[PDB]
Amino acid sequence: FKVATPYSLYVCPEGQNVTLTCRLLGPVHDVTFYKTWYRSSRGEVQTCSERRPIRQLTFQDLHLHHGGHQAAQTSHDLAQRHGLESASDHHGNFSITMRNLTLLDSGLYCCLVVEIRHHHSEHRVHGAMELQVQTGKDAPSNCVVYPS
Template sequence: MDVFCALLLCFHLLTTVQVSGERHTFSVSVPHRVYECPEGANVTLTCVQSGPKAHSEDKLWDTWLFTPHLQEHCHKGAHPRGSSHNNGTLGVQYTEKGNSFSINLQNIKHRDQGKYCCLLLEVNKQKVEQGAREFIHLNVLPSTTRTQNGSLKCSEWSHSPTDDSVAEGLAIAACVAFILCLPLILMLVYRQRQTVERHRRAHELVRMDSEAQAHENPVFLGDSPQPKPRTISQIMRQSSETGRHLLSDPGTPFSSNIQGEFFFPAQEPIAESPNLLE
Protein backbone atom coordinates (compact mmCIF):
# COMPACT_ATOMS: atom_id res chain seq x y z
CA MET A 1 0.00 0.00 0.00
CA ASP A 2 2.88 2.36 0.78
CA VAL A 3 4.51 1.64 -2.58
CA PHE A 4 1.23 2.38 -4.38
CA CYS A 5 0.92 5.72 -2.58
CA ALA A 6 4.51 6.58 -3.50
CA LEU A 7 3.92 5.81 -7.16
CA LEU A 8 0.72 7.86 -7.12
CA LEU A 9 2.60 10.79 -5.58
CA CYS A 10 5.36 10.53 -8.19
CA PHE A 11 2.80 10.44 -11.01
CA HIS A 12 1.09 13.54 -9.62
CA LEU A 13 4.46 15.30 -9.37
CA LEU A 14 5.33 14.34 -12.96
CA THR A 15 1.97 15.65 -14.20
CA THR A 16 2.46 18.91 -12.34
CA VAL A 17 5.93 19.42 -13.80
CA GLN A 18 4.66 18.58 -17.29
CA VAL A 19 1.71 21.00 -17.11
CA SER A 20 3.95 23.73 -15.70
CA GLY A 21 6.46 23.21 -18.50
CA GLU A 22 3.78 23.27 -21.20
CA ARG A 23 2.23 26.43 -19.78
CA HIS A 24 5.39 28.56 -19.66
CA THR A 25 7.56 27.13 -22.46
CA PHE A 26 8.51 29.50 -25.27
CA SER A 27 9.23 27.29 -28.28
CA VAL A 28 9.17 26.87 -32.05
CA SER A 29 7.66 23.92 -33.91
CA VAL A 30 7.59 22.79 -37.55
CA PRO A 31 4.51 21.36 -39.30
CA HIS A 32 6.76 19.32 -41.59
CA ARG A 33 10.24 18.07 -40.81
CA VAL A 34 11.39 16.93 -44.29
CA TYR A 35 10.69 18.35 -47.74
CA GLU A 36 11.59 16.49 -50.94
CA CYS A 37 11.49 18.62 -54.07
CA PRO A 38 12.69 18.13 -57.65
CA GLU A 39 15.04 20.65 -59.16
CA GLY A 40 13.31 23.76 -60.49
CA ALA A 41 10.42 23.62 -57.99
CA ASN A 42 9.39 26.29 -55.52
CA VAL A 43 9.20 25.44 -51.83
CA THR A 44 7.98 27.24 -48.71
CA LEU A 45 9.46 26.22 -45.33
CA THR A 46 7.41 27.22 -42.27
CA CYS A 47 7.99 27.44 -38.52
CA VAL A 48 5.37 28.21 -35.86
CA GLN A 49 5.91 30.04 -32.56
CA SER A 50 4.17 28.77 -29.41
CA GLY A 51 4.20 29.75 -25.76
CA PRO A 52 3.76 33.17 -24.16
CA LYS A 53 6.24 36.00 -24.18
CA ALA A 54 7.97 37.08 -21.01
CA HIS A 55 6.56 40.60 -21.41
CA SER A 56 3.65 41.59 -23.60
CA GLU A 57 5.48 44.66 -24.94
CA ASP A 58 8.48 42.61 -26.14
CA LYS A 59 9.10 42.22 -29.86
CA LEU A 60 9.80 38.98 -31.73
CA TRP A 61 12.67 38.79 -34.19
CA ASP A 62 13.03 35.82 -36.53
CA THR A 63 15.66 34.73 -39.01
CA TRP A 64 16.67 31.69 -41.09
CA LEU A 65 20.07 30.01 -41.22
CA PHE A 66 21.39 27.34 -43.58
CA THR A 67 24.05 24.63 -43.70
CA PRO A 68 24.53 22.07 -46.49
CA HIS A 69 25.57 19.43 -43.94
CA LEU A 70 22.63 17.72 -42.25
CA GLN A 71 24.69 16.61 -39.24
CA GLU A 72 26.01 20.08 -38.42
CA HIS A 73 24.45 22.96 -36.49
CA CYS A 74 23.49 26.11 -38.30
CA HIS A 75 26.10 28.84 -37.89
CA LYS A 76 25.46 32.51 -37.25
CA GLY A 77 25.45 34.61 -40.42
CA ALA A 78 25.00 31.63 -42.79
CA HIS A 79 21.67 32.57 -44.40
CA PRO A 80 19.91 30.70 -47.22
CA ARG A 81 21.49 31.73 -50.53
CA GLY A 82 23.48 34.30 -48.59
CA SER A 83 20.56 36.67 -48.02
CA SER A 84 18.85 37.56 -44.71
CA HIS A 85 16.09 39.61 -46.36
CA ASN A 86 13.81 39.45 -49.38
CA ASN A 87 15.81 39.25 -52.58
CA GLY A 88 13.99 38.71 -55.87
CA THR A 89 17.22 38.26 -57.77
CA LEU A 90 18.28 35.33 -55.58
CA GLY A 91 14.74 33.97 -55.37
CA VAL A 92 14.43 34.34 -51.56
CA GLN A 93 11.35 35.70 -49.84
CA TYR A 94 10.63 35.92 -46.08
CA THR A 95 7.04 36.17 -44.83
CA GLU A 96 5.27 36.41 -41.47
CA LYS A 97 1.65 35.55 -40.73
CA GLY A 98 0.29 35.39 -37.20
CA ASN A 99 2.47 33.03 -35.13
CA SER A 100 4.15 31.52 -38.19
CA PHE A 101 7.10 32.73 -40.24
CA SER A 102 8.30 31.20 -43.49
CA ILE A 103 10.95 31.30 -46.19
CA ASN A 104 10.14 30.75 -49.86
CA LEU A 105 12.81 29.50 -52.25
CA GLN A 106 12.17 29.73 -55.99
CA ASN A 107 13.66 27.48 -58.64
CA ILE A 108 15.64 25.38 -56.20
CA LYS A 109 18.85 23.70 -57.26
CA HIS A 110 20.88 20.86 -55.83
CA ARG A 111 23.03 23.36 -53.94
CA ASP A 112 19.93 24.33 -51.92
CA GLN A 113 19.82 20.88 -50.36
CA GLY A 114 20.67 20.88 -46.67
CA LYS A 115 19.48 21.91 -43.23
CA TYR A 116 17.41 25.07 -42.66
CA CYS A 117 17.18 26.47 -39.13
CA CYS A 118 14.50 28.92 -38.02
CA LEU A 119 15.50 31.09 -35.07
CA LEU A 120 13.06 33.16 -33.01
CA LEU A 121 14.17 35.66 -30.36
CA GLU A 122 12.18 37.79 -27.91
CA VAL A 123 13.84 41.18 -27.63
CA ASN A 124 13.23 43.84 -24.97
CA LYS A 125 15.22 47.06 -25.40
CA GLN A 126 18.09 45.41 -27.26
CA LYS A 127 18.15 42.60 -24.70
CA VAL A 128 17.25 39.02 -25.59
CA GLU A 129 14.75 37.68 -23.05
CA GLN A 130 14.33 34.20 -24.50
CA GLY A 131 14.79 32.32 -27.74
CA ALA A 132 13.92 29.09 -29.54
CA ARG A 133 14.94 27.32 -32.73
CA GLU A 134 13.97 24.41 -34.97
CA PHE A 135 15.29 22.84 -38.16
CA ILE A 136 13.97 21.47 -41.47
CA HIS A 137 15.64 19.15 -43.96
CA LEU A 138 15.36 19.88 -47.68
CA ASN A 139 16.21 17.09 -50.13
CA VAL A 140 16.55 18.06 -53.80
CA LEU A 141 15.85 15.30 -56.36
CA PRO A 142 16.55 15.23 -60.09
CA SER A 143 13.67 16.74 -62.06
CA THR A 144 11.89 13.68 -63.49
CA THR A 145 8.21 14.09 -62.50
CA ARG A 146 5.92 16.90 -63.62
CA THR A 147 2.24 17.47 -63.14
CA GLN A 148 -0.26 17.94 -65.98
CA ASN A 149 0.09 21.73 -65.92
CA GLY A 150 3.86 21.51 -66.12
CA SER A 151 4.59 22.59 -62.52
CA LEU A 152 6.75 20.68 -60.07
CA LYS A 153 5.48 19.45 -56.70
CA CYS A 154 7.27 18.89 -53.39
CA SER A 155 6.59 16.05 -50.99
CA GLU A 156 6.17 16.96 -47.33
CA TRP A 157 6.68 14.54 -44.48
CA SER A 158 4.27 15.32 -41.67
CA HIS A 159 5.76 15.94 -38.30
CA SER A 160 4.11 15.96 -34.89
CA PRO A 161 5.41 18.58 -32.42
CA THR A 162 5.37 15.95 -29.68
CA ASP A 163 8.20 14.09 -31.42
CA ASP A 164 10.94 16.56 -30.50
CA SER A 165 10.53 19.55 -28.22
CA VAL A 166 7.62 18.16 -26.21
CA ALA A 167 9.26 14.75 -26.03
CA GLU A 168 12.43 16.33 -24.68
CA GLY A 169 10.39 18.26 -22.12
CA LEU A 170 8.66 15.08 -20.99
CA ALA A 171 11.98 13.28 -20.68
CA ILE A 172 13.43 16.08 -18.56
CA ALA A 173 10.29 16.20 -16.40
CA ALA A 174 10.43 12.42 -15.92
CA CYS A 175 14.08 12.61 -14.82
CA VAL A 176 13.32 15.40 -12.36
CA ALA A 177 10.34 13.54 -10.91
CA PHE A 178 12.39 10.34 -10.58
CA ILE A 179 15.19 12.14 -8.75
CA LEU A 180 12.71 13.75 -6.37
CA CYS A 181 10.92 10.45 -5.71
CA LEU A 182 14.08 8.34 -5.36
CA PRO A 183 14.59 8.98 -1.59
CA LEU A 184 10.95 8.08 -0.92
CA ILE A 185 11.21 4.87 -2.94
CA LEU A 186 14.42 3.86 -1.16
CA MET A 187 12.82 4.50 2.25
CA LEU A 188 9.80 2.35 1.34
CA VAL A 189 12.05 -0.46 0.12
CA TYR A 190 14.04 -0.28 3.38
CA ARG A 191 10.86 -0.43 5.48
CA GLN A 192 9.58 -3.37 3.44
CA ARG A 193 12.80 -5.30 4.02
CA GLN A 194 12.67 -4.56 7.75
CA THR A 195 9.08 -5.86 7.93
CA VAL A 196 10.01 -9.07 6.13
CA GLU A 197 12.99 -9.56 8.47
CA ARG A 198 10.81 -9.10 11.58
CA HIS A 199 8.27 -11.61 10.27
CA ARG A 200 11.03 -14.09 9.55
CA ARG A 201 12.48 -13.76 13.06
CA ALA A 202 9.04 -14.12 14.64
CA HIS A 203 8.38 -17.26 12.63
CA GLU A 204 11.77 -18.64 13.67
CA LEU A 205 11.04 -18.02 17.36
CA VAL A 206 7.67 -19.75 17.09
CA ARG A 207 9.29 -22.72 15.38
CA MET A 208 12.00 -23.02 18.05
CA ASP A 209 9.38 -22.81 20.81
CA SER A 210 7.26 -25.47 19.17
CA GLU A 211 10.25 -27.80 18.83
CA ALA A 212 10.97 -27.34 22.53
CA GLN A 213 7.40 -28.48 23.29
CA ALA A 214 7.59 -31.44 20.86
CA HIS A 215 5.20 -29.92 18.32
CA GLU A 216 5.72 -30.88 14.76
CA ASN A 217 3.86 -27.95 13.21
CA PRO A 218 2.53 -25.34 15.66
CA VAL A 219 0.81 -23.37 12.92
CA PHE A 220 -1.96 -25.96 12.56
CA LEU A 221 -2.41 -26.51 16.30
CA GLY A 222 -4.14 -23.20 17.01
CA ASP A 223 -3.33 -20.63 19.66
CA SER A 224 -2.75 -23.18 22.49
CA PRO A 225 -0.95 -26.21 21.04
CA GLN A 226 -1.53 -29.50 22.85
CA PRO A 227 1.21 -32.07 23.42
CA LYS A 228 1.16 -35.04 21.12
CA PRO A 229 -0.18 -38.21 22.85
CA ARG A 230 2.27 -41.08 23.30
CA THR A 231 1.56 -44.71 22.50
CA ILE A 232 1.90 -47.63 24.97
CA SER A 233 5.02 -48.86 23.19
CA GLN A 234 6.67 -45.47 23.67
CA ILE A 235 5.74 -45.45 27.37
CA MET A 236 7.13 -48.98 27.85
CA ARG A 237 10.26 -48.10 25.91
CA GLN A 238 10.83 -45.04 28.09
CA SER A 239 10.30 -47.06 31.25
CA SER A 240 12.65 -49.81 30.14
CA GLU A 241 15.34 -47.26 29.39
CA THR A 242 15.20 -46.02 32.98
CA GLY A 243 15.66 -49.56 34.34
CA ARG A 244 12.04 -50.15 35.42
CA HIS A 245 9.84 -52.98 34.13
CA LEU A 246 6.25 -52.00 34.60
CA LEU A 247 4.79 -55.49 34.29
CA SER A 248 7.26 -57.09 36.68
CA ASP A 249 7.22 -54.47 39.47
CA PRO A 250 5.10 -55.28 42.51
CA GLY A 251 2.09 -53.08 42.96
CA THR A 252 1.44 -52.50 39.22
CA PRO A 253 -2.12 -53.06 37.96
CA PHE A 254 -1.02 -56.10 36.00
CA SER A 255 0.69 -57.92 38.93
CA SER A 256 -0.95 -59.47 42.00
CA ASN A 257 -0.24 -58.14 45.47
CA ILE A 258 1.69 -61.12 46.88
CA GLN A 259 3.46 -60.78 50.17
CA GLY A 260 6.65 -62.81 50.46
CA GLU A 261 6.04 -64.97 47.37
CA PHE A 262 7.20 -64.94 43.82
CA PHE A 263 4.91 -64.30 40.95
CA PHE A 264 4.82 -68.03 40.13
CA PRO A 265 3.97 -70.16 43.32
CA ALA A 266 6.39 -72.84 44.41
CA GLN A 267 5.48 -76.45 43.39
CA GLU A 268 5.73 -79.51 45.59
CA PRO A 269 8.58 -81.86 44.67
CA ILE A 270 7.49 -84.78 42.51
CA ALA A 271 8.23 -88.21 43.96
CA GLU A 272 10.54 -90.27 41.94
CA SER A 273 8.93 -93.23 40.25
CA PRO A 274 10.58 -96.60 41.06
CA ASN A 275 10.00 -97.71 37.49
CA LEU A 276 12.09 -94.88 36.13
CA LEU A 277 14.95 -95.75 38.49
CA GLU A 278 15.26 -99.28 37.19
Protein backbone atom coordinates (compact mmCIF):
# COMPACT_ATOMS: atom_id res chain seq x y z
CA PHE A 1 0.00 0.00 0.00
CA LYS A 2 0.95 3.67 -0.22
CA VAL A 3 0.24 6.68 1.97
CA ALA A 4 -1.79 9.50 0.46
CA THR A 5 -1.67 12.99 1.96
CA PRO A 6 -4.86 14.82 0.85
CA TYR A 7 -3.48 18.23 1.87
CA SER A 8 0.18 19.18 1.56
CA LEU A 9 -0.07 22.56 3.32
CA TYR A 10 -2.18 23.69 6.28
CA VAL A 11 -2.17 27.40 7.16
CA CYS A 12 -3.71 28.16 10.55
CA PRO A 13 -3.98 31.12 12.95
CA GLU A 14 -2.71 30.86 16.48
CA GLY A 15 -5.23 29.39 18.93
CA GLN A 16 -7.10 27.24 16.44
CA ASN A 17 -7.40 23.44 16.37
CA VAL A 18 -6.20 21.45 13.36
CA THR A 19 -6.41 17.82 12.22
CA LEU A 20 -3.67 16.52 9.91
CA THR A 21 -4.59 13.45 7.89
CA CYS A 22 -2.94 10.58 6.02
CA ARG A 23 -4.83 7.90 4.16
CA LEU A 24 -3.74 4.37 3.28
CA LEU A 25 -4.37 3.50 -0.37
CA GLY A 26 -4.02 0.19 -2.10
CA PRO A 27 -4.15 -3.34 -0.70
CA VAL A 28 -4.04 -3.33 3.08
CA HIS A 29 -5.84 -11.16 11.69
CA ASP A 30 -2.27 -11.80 12.87
CA VAL A 31 -1.17 -8.55 11.22
CA THR A 32 -0.30 -5.50 13.31
CA PHE A 33 0.25 -1.86 12.41
CA TYR A 34 2.64 0.63 13.96
CA LYS A 35 1.58 4.22 13.23
CA THR A 36 3.16 7.42 14.52
CA TRP A 37 3.84 11.10 13.81
CA TYR A 38 6.96 13.28 14.03
CA ARG A 39 8.30 16.52 12.64
CA SER A 40 11.07 16.35 10.11
CA SER A 41 12.48 18.11 7.06
CA ARG A 42 12.68 17.78 3.29
CA GLY A 43 16.31 16.77 2.91
CA GLU A 44 18.20 16.64 -0.37
CA VAL A 45 17.52 12.96 -1.09
CA GLN A 46 15.61 12.06 2.11
CA THR A 47 12.26 13.33 3.37
CA CYS A 48 10.87 12.33 6.78
CA SER A 49 14.24 10.82 7.67
CA GLU A 50 15.14 12.48 10.98
CA ARG A 51 12.46 12.42 13.67
CA ARG A 52 11.89 15.62 15.68
CA PRO A 53 9.49 16.12 18.58
CA ILE A 54 5.94 17.45 18.41
CA ARG A 55 5.12 19.61 21.45
CA GLN A 56 8.14 18.09 23.23
CA LEU A 57 6.74 14.56 22.67
CA THR A 58 8.59 12.05 20.50
CA PHE A 59 7.37 9.54 17.94
CA GLN A 60 7.57 6.86 20.65
CA ASP A 61 5.30 8.95 22.89
CA LEU A 62 2.78 9.37 20.06
CA HIS A 63 2.68 5.95 18.49
CA LEU A 64 -0.27 3.58 18.09
CA HIS A 65 0.03 -0.20 17.80
CA HIS A 66 -2.98 -2.26 16.78
CA GLY A 67 -4.05 -5.35 14.88
CA GLY A 68 -5.61 -5.07 11.46
CA HIS A 69 -9.13 -5.60 12.84
CA GLN A 70 -8.95 -2.76 15.39
CA ALA A 71 -9.00 1.00 15.49
CA ALA A 72 -6.89 2.85 18.05
CA GLN A 73 -6.53 6.30 19.62
CA THR A 74 -3.93 7.81 21.86
CA SER A 75 -4.57 8.15 25.58
CA HIS A 76 -6.77 10.72 27.28
CA ASP A 77 -3.66 11.64 29.29
CA LEU A 78 -1.55 12.88 26.38
CA ALA A 79 -4.63 14.72 25.04
CA GLN A 80 -5.32 16.58 28.28
CA ARG A 81 -1.61 17.07 28.92
CA HIS A 82 -0.42 18.19 25.50
CA GLY A 83 -3.48 18.91 23.38
CA LEU A 84 -2.61 16.07 20.96
CA GLU A 85 -4.68 13.06 19.90
CA SER A 86 -3.71 10.53 17.20
CA ALA A 87 -6.30 8.13 15.81
CA SER A 88 -6.55 5.30 13.29
CA ASP A 89 -9.95 4.14 12.00
CA HIS A 90 -10.92 0.90 10.27
CA HIS A 91 -10.69 2.39 6.76
CA GLY A 92 -7.10 3.60 6.46
CA ASN A 93 -7.60 7.08 7.91
CA PHE A 94 -4.79 8.07 10.29
CA SER A 95 -4.82 11.54 11.83
CA ILE A 96 -3.42 13.73 14.58
CA THR A 97 -5.48 16.53 16.11
CA MET A 98 -3.60 19.46 17.65
CA ARG A 99 -5.42 21.84 20.02
CA ASN A 100 -4.58 25.47 20.80
CA LEU A 101 -2.01 26.02 18.07
CA THR A 102 0.99 28.28 18.69
CA LEU A 103 3.71 29.57 16.37
CA LEU A 104 6.13 26.93 17.66
CA ASP A 105 3.88 24.20 16.19
CA SER A 106 4.89 25.08 12.61
CA GLY A 107 6.94 22.54 10.73
CA LEU A 108 6.96 19.58 8.38
CA TYR A 109 4.86 16.77 9.82
CA CYS A 110 5.34 13.12 8.80
CA CYS A 111 2.96 10.20 9.31
CA LEU A 112 4.68 6.81 9.43
CA VAL A 113 2.93 3.47 8.98
CA VAL A 114 4.64 0.10 9.38
CA GLU A 115 2.81 -3.16 8.61
CA ILE A 116 4.08 -6.18 10.57
CA ARG A 117 3.43 -9.90 10.08
CA HIS A 118 5.09 -12.50 12.33
CA HIS A 119 7.62 -9.89 13.55
CA HIS A 120 8.69 -9.05 9.94
CA SER A 121 8.31 -5.52 8.49
CA GLU A 122 6.57 -5.96 5.15
CA HIS A 123 5.69 -2.31 4.36
CA ARG A 124 7.11 0.95 5.73
CA VAL A 125 5.64 4.10 4.18
CA HIS A 126 5.38 7.76 5.12
CA GLY A 127 3.55 10.90 4.10
CA ALA A 128 4.59 14.50 4.64
CA MET A 129 2.67 17.78 4.97
CA GLU A 130 3.55 21.30 6.06
CA LEU A 131 1.84 23.19 8.89
CA GLN A 132 2.32 26.98 9.01
CA VAL A 133 0.95 28.71 12.11
CA GLN A 134 0.46 32.42 11.49
CA THR A 135 0.10 35.40 13.80
CA GLY A 136 -1.15 38.92 13.38
CA LYS A 137 -2.91 40.69 10.58
CA ASP A 138 -2.64 38.35 7.55
CA ALA A 139 -3.37 35.15 9.47
CA PRO A 140 -6.68 33.61 8.29
CA SER A 141 -9.78 33.32 10.47
CA ASN A 142 -9.49 29.51 10.59
CA CYS A 143 -7.27 26.98 8.83
CA VAL A 144 -6.74 27.12 5.05
CA VAL A 145 -5.79 23.81 3.42
CA TYR A 146 -4.05 23.28 0.07
CA PRO A 147 -4.46 19.91 -1.69
CA SER A 148 -1.37 18.02 -2.83
